[PDB]
DNA sequence: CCAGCGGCAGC
DNA sequence: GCTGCGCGCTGG
């Protein structure tokens, strides 16, 4: 299952490979602007490249990265939980990971599995995107 | 110069 | 079903 490209280039669209940083995406997208967010989200994943690394980091060096995005302590400590979580539980979706509600579990169930017709987003952007392929389907 | 704004956990 | 978390951005 790949999710096609859309006229509204969500980050999501380039991620779907990797559900672990399609979810961090998601995360550094909690009440922060993607203008904002996405150059930083490149930063973390360099310094920490998968859900392994994470796993393993201070939260105080994650803050770092994050503090002109703010919100910059509890989302520092929710990725490495997350992080964590994601290796650990046996989860089928990320919902039920630390970190992830409605809005990343929307998200992993278009562009990682093939869910897309059973999802009703509530996210603005994520509308854009499950309303043009209900349109663009066939 | 100023204030409104861009998910999730926990209780 | 309510609150805290939080910065730089942006328009006026």
Known sequence: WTPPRSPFNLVQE???????????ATIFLNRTSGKMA???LWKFLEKY???????????????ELLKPLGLYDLRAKTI???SDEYLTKQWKYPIELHG???????????????????????????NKYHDWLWENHE
């Open 14 to 24: 380039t991620l779907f490979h990797d559900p672990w940083k399609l979810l961090i």
């Open 100 to 126: 992830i509600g409605k809005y990343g579990n929307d998200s992993y169930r278009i562009f990682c599995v093939n869910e897309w017709k059973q999802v009703h987003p509530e996210d603005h952007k994520l």
């Open 38 to 40: 996405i150059p930083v």
């Open 49 to 63: 490249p998968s859900a392994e690394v994470a796993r393993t980091a201070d939260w105080r060096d994650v803050s």
């Open 80 to 82: 490495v939980k997350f």
